[PDB]
DNA sequence: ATCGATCGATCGATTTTTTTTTTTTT
DNA sequence: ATCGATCGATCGAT
């Protein structure tokens, strides 16, 4: 009626713009014929569903409707303001301009499109002997449509919609708007197919029923609306036919603020967004992206009279996504810069943590666990690690925590952790109530998350018992055991293990004997193959030279020089598993020799006897590992020949792990 | 040659293609394994089944490939697994009955054929984890793996509803049938009518077990950062309770999704449908 | 014409809900 | 806000 709900004029009109839409639709120049022709048949070809659109090309054809007239009102200035009218009406012209066949449907291919022709086979035959309802254009689509906005070099044309923004930068006037913001993903609760229109079937009168559903809910129809059952005493029964009704894949995510955008006060703002179509599964939780999409509110249900006023509360929809930080063939050559350089075991050893000065010998062993291997298979079976567990003992911090910052970063499956920090419940699959979608789904991590990869660790003395026993079992490795609740499972943890821990308070006392200084259990240290004692005595010469490096930065961003060229991880990492494919086989020559030095070590460590320097007893596990060491060391040489120097090279690192306690 | 409406897979003759497939295989599947027991897998195992009267055949899948015919049935089963099992469980009955007529009097005698037989097909292609799953996949057989997070207590389900009126009082009732229960306002006894409320004693009506199990699959190959998603399942009969919780399993079934009332008072259903496994077969 | 059942317009009732300060045990 | 039952009348049957 007039008055209430008044009809209101706006200077903007798409009536001829829809024609101007089809002027732009199909026909086009810049990219034989226009890009929109065979590409729209490309969807008619059914090798594509998602329809991708950008604001970039609209400007040129708008320039093409411009320069180059006749002059026409701009679409794009009417887009970012609404653009939801463009997600349909601009798109609704596609049935008019789309080719009929355009090729063979075959059989499969797929279902649906074989049924949808049957639905239209049933729909057209309804009117065949009938002599007039038809399937709405929205009822049969089968293809998604997307928009990617212009930043851009077009904005400096000069020409806005693409300017990255904070959640804090989100105005209320941006509702309805196709917009773009940078943000960190969060949640990313699982996607599920959602129907636009139920298909009920009358049975008795048959036909087909299509009722639209919007947002979260709908009110389902009943009885029979079919006209054959209309005005007849008998109304047919109907319920939803899921094979018939169309579905849409629906994902969603919260988007956190980058935290540099944030004000000094307040709080990071999570932003709810909902993923749909081919755009689904395009994101993971915690990833940083410039998000581009239209922003619309989805009230209400309710409540209702509760809200009031309405106070929309809205949400954002995802139009498009731009993510931040997205053989043994020819990459062997990318290995070959340092292959021709040689010194794989050193230059790469020097390649480790170029940021921290000295302790390259410590870094020297770092290269081994970063590689490790190679395990064994006894066929019993019992598999043996296979993995290096390294500990670092010294205080104060020395910036030891920094070594883990570099190592895990480079390392695949790199996981940095600390005593508290992740608990043993954090290293196990632990039941927790899932917000929104329910319920009580288990989420594991840490050890379970770090399996088949290195785990860096700090506050290792403060991990207490609950962690110690777990990692005590994590030293049994290849397992994580939970008898808790109804959960009886034991899950494989392939985790590589390294934790640096601080000596007994306040710092280590040279008078203090070994193992009295350490805060860790002996059985906990016995399954350790290596520990590097970090005790720091001031050396005026060394203090300057290191201070000099501490002078050298902040002075500049580039540390390494006079002289060296640390390998970048990507090219460096590629040699890792490339070397890990080797699996060196032991030569018996070095084989028995390692046995020889063992009974020597089984002798000398025991002849140390009571207290003092220690540690005994030189158990076979270390030899079991020391053998694996040359097996890990051989991998850097590859060649799987296991040299004796390659063997003895580890034995050199064995005594060095200790004996610095004299310093 | 008839047809099935949406299935576009004609009734019978697939039963025939099923039989000559069931009647003769040997190994054409070894042709894919490239050879390197000569008799067909089924007629031996089909015999193995008849004595025990266990029914519930576990099928094979894939023996429809590589072998002919059924090459399309191999497809047509994967297109519409629900209806395919419907003909096949019945045909196995006749395929037993057809087997018994040659040996004539068997198992004392024709009543053992009256016993129901059914296929529990497995190894349909290879499904990819869970998280990969498509909307288009609405109903199709799926190979899956995971250990059971929790086993719920067995849930009772409707088969044939029991009914009565004020008069006489009389016991006339109708099966639950579809997902709806339709009770006449009247009436049985006196007939009559009269328009009495229809009495329902639920202890009299039929029941069967459907036992819900939430299952977290561990397909590995985890997309990272994807969460350790879990899986809903209902199952039925022997499939019910036969699955211990906490055990990694090959259990297969078609996809399923169904709506639920938002208010749980109002008729309104919430949009998109919640999804669960059809638990077609276990391993 | 008495009686009924039948449909509809009348009437009115039902729509969220668990975490941070604790405290007796060695 | 919608669904629910009361209750009112009316048009057919006997």
Swiss-Prot record, chain A:
Pfam families: HTH_MCM7, MCM, MCM_lid, MCM_N, MCM_OB. This is DNA replication licensing factor MCM7. CDD domains: MCM7. Acts as a component of the MCM2-7 complex (MCM complex) which is the putative replicative helicase essential for 'once per cell cycle' DNA replication initiation and elongation in eukaryotic cells. Core component of CDC45-MCM-GINS (CMG) helicase, the molecular machine that unwinds template DNA during replication, and around which the replisome is built. GO terms for cellular component: chromosome, telomeric region; CMG complex; cytoplasm; DNA replication preinitiation complex; MCM complex; MCM core complex; nuclear pre-replicative complex; nuclear replication fork. ATP 2 binds at residues 527, 621. GO terms for biological process: DNA replication; DNA replication initiation; DNA strand elongation involved in DNA replication; double-strand break repair via break-induced replication; nuclear DNA replication; pre-replicative complex assembly involved in nuclear cell cycle DNA replication; premeiotic DNA replication; silent mating-type cassette heterochromatin formation. The gene is MCM7. Belongs to the MCM family. It is found in: Cytoplasm; Nucleus. PANTHER family: DNA REPLICATION LICENSING FACTOR MCM FAMILY MEMBER (PTHR11630), DNA REPLICATION LICENSING FACTOR MCM7 (PTHR11630:SF26). It catalyses: ATP + H2O = ADP + phosphate + H(+). The lineage of its organism: Eukaryota, Fungi, Dikarya, Ascomycota, Saccharomycotina. GO terms for molecular function: ATP binding; ATP hydrolysis activity; chromatin binding; DNA replication origin binding; MCM complex binding; single-stranded DNA helicase activity. Keywords: ATP-binding, Cell cycle, Cytoplasm, DNA replication, DNA-binding, Helicase, Hydrolase, Nucleotide-binding, Nucleus, Phosphoprotein.
Curated annotation (Swiss-Prot), chain B:
The lineage of its organism: Eukaryota, Fungi, Dikarya, Ascomycota, Saccharomycotina. This is DNA replication licensing factor MCM4. Component of the MCM2-7 complex. The complex forms a toroidal hexameric ring with the proposed subunit order MCM2-MCM6-MCM4-MCM7-MCM3-MCM5; loaded onto DNA, forms a head-head double hexamer. Acts as a component of the MCM2-7 complex (MCM complex) which is the putative replicative helicase essential for 'once per cell cycle' DNA replication initiation and elongation in eukaryotic cells. The active ATPase sites in the MCM2-7 ring are formed through the interaction surfaces of two neighboring subunits such that a critical structure of a conserved arginine finger motif is provided in trans relative to the ATP-binding site of the Walker A box of the adjacent subunit. The six ATPase active sites, however, are likely to contribute differentially to the complex helicase activity. Belongs to the MCM family. The chain holds residues 177 to 467 of 933 of the full protein. It is found in: Nucleus. Present with 8800 molecules/cell in log phase SD medium. Early fractionation of eukaryotic MCM proteins yielded a variety of dimeric, trimeric and tetrameric complexes with unclear biological significance. Specifically a MCM467 subcomplex is shown to have in vitro helicase activity which is inhibited by the MCM2 subunit. The MCM2-7 hexamer is the proposed physiological active complex. The gene is MCM4.
């Amino acid at each position: 009626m007039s008055a209430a709900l008044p009809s209101i004029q706006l200077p903007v009109d798409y009536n001829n713009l829809f024609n101007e839409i089809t002027d732009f639709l199909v026909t086009f120049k810049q990219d034989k014929g226009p890009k929109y022709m065979a590409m729209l048949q490309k969807v008619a070809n059914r090798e594509l569903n998602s329809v991708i659109i950008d604001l970039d090309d609209i400007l040129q054809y708008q320039n093409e409707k411009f320069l180059q007239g006749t002059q026409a009102d701009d679409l794009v200035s009417a887009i970012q303001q609404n653009a939801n009218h463009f997600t349909e009406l601009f798109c609704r012209a596609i049935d008019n301009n789309m080719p009929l066949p355009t090729k063979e449907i075959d059989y499969k291919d797929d279902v649906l499109d074989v049924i949808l022709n049957q639905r239209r086979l049933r729909n057209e035959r309804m009117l065949s002997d009938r002599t007039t309802e038809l399937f709405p254009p929205n009822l049969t689509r089968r293809y998604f449509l997307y928009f990617k906005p212009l930043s851009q070099n077009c904005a400096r044309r000069y020409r806005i919609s693409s300017k990255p923004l904070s959640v804090r930068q989100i105005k209320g006037d941006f509702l309805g708007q196709l917009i773009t913001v940078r943000g960190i993903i969060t949640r990313v609760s699982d996607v599920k197919p959602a129907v636009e229109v139920i298909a009920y079937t009358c049975d008795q009168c048959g036909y087909e029923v299509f009722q639209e559903v919007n947002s979260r809910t709908f009110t389902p129809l009943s009885e029979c609306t079919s006209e054959e059952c209309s005005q007849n005493q008998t109304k047919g029964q109907l319920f939803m036919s899921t094979r018939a009704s169309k579905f849409s894949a629906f994902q969603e995510c919260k988007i956190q603020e980058l935290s540099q955008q944030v004000p000094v006060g307040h709080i990071p703002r999570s932003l709810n967004i909902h993923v749909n179509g081919t755009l689904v599964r395009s994101l993971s939780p915690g990833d940083i992206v410039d998000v581009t999409g239209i922003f619309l509110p989805a009230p209400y249900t309710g409540f209702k009279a509760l809200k009031a006023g309405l106070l929309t509360e809205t949400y954002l929809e995802a139009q498009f996504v731009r993510q931040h930080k997205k053989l043994t063939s020819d990459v062997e050559e990318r290995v070959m810069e340092l292959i021709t350089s040689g010194d794989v075991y050193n230059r790469l050893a020097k390649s480790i943590a170029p940021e921290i000065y000295g302790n390259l010998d410590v870094k020297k062993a770092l290269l081994l666990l970063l590689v490790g291997g190679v395990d064994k298979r006894v066929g019993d079976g019992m598999k043996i690690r296979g993995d290096i567990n390294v500990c670092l003992m010294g205080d104060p911090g020395v910036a030891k925590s920094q070594l883990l910052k570099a190592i895990c970063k480079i390392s695949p499956r790199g996981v940095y952790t600390t005593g508290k920090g992740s608990s043993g419940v954090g290293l196990t699959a632990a039941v927790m109530k899932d917000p929104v979608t329910d319920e009580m789904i288990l989420e594991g991590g840490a050890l379970v998350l770090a399996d088949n990869g290195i785990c860096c660790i700090d506050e290792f003395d403060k991990m207490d018992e609950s962690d110690r026993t777990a990692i005590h079992e994590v030293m049994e490795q290849q397992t994580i055991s939970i008898s808790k609740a109804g959960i009886n499972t034991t899950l494989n943890a392939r985790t590589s293990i390294l934790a640096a821990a601080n000596p007994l308070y306040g710092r280590y006392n040279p008078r203090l004997s070994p193992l009295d200084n350490i805060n860790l259990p002996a059985a906990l240290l016995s399954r350790f193959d290596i520990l590097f004692l970090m005790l720091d005595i001031p050396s005026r010469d060394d203090d300057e030279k290191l201070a000099e490096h501490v002078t050298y930065v902040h002075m500049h961003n580039k540390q390494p020089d006079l002289d060296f060229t640390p390998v970048e991880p990507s090219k460096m990492r590629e040699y890792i598993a490339y070397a890990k494919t080797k699996r060196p086989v032991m030569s018996e020559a070095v084989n028995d020799y390692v046995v020889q030095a063992y009974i020597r070590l089984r002798q000398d460590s025991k002849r140390e006897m009571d207290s003092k320097f220690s540690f005994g007893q030189a158990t076979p596990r270390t030899l079991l590992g020391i053998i694996r060491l040359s097996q890990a060391l051989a991998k850097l040489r590859l060649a799987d020949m296991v040299d004796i120097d390659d063997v003895e090279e580890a034995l050199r690192l064995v005594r060095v792990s200790k004996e610095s306690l004299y310093q | 040659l008839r047809i099935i409406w949406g299935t576009n897979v004609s009734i019978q003759e697939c039963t025939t293609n099923f039989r000559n497939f069931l009647m003769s295989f040997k190994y054409k599947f070894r042709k894919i394994l490239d050879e390197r027991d000569e008799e067909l897998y089924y007629i031996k195992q089909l015999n193995e089944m008849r004595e025990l009267g266990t029914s519930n055949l576990n099928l094979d899948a894939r023996n429809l490939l590589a072998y002919k015919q059924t090459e399309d049935l191999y497809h047509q089963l994967l297109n519409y697994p629900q209806e395919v099992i419907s003909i096949m469980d019945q045909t196995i009955k006749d395929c037993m009955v057809s087997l018994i007529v040659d040996n004539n009097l068997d198992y004392d005698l024709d009543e053992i054929e009256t016993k129901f037989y059914k296929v529990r097909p497995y190894n349909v292609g290879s499904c990819k984890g869970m998280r990969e799953l498509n909307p288009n996949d609405i109903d199709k057989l799926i190979n899956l793996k995971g250990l059971v997070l929790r086993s719920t207590p067995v849930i009772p389900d409707m088969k044939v509803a029991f009914f009565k009126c004020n008069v006489c009082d009389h016991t006339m009732a109708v099966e639950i049938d579809r997902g709806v229960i339709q009770e006449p306002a009247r009436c049985e006894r006196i007939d009559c009518n009269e328009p009495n409320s229809m009495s329902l004693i639920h202890n009299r009506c039929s029941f069967a077990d459907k036992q819900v199990i939430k299952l977290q699959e561990t397909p590995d190959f985890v997309p990272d950062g994807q969460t350790p998603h879990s899986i809903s399942l209902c199952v039925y009969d022997e499939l019910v309770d036969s699955c211990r919780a906490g055990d990694r399993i090959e259990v297969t079934g078609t996809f399923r999704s169904i709506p639920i009332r938002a208010n749980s008072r109002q008729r309104v259903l919430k949009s998109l449908y919640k999804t669960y496994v059809d638990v077609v077969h276990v391993k």
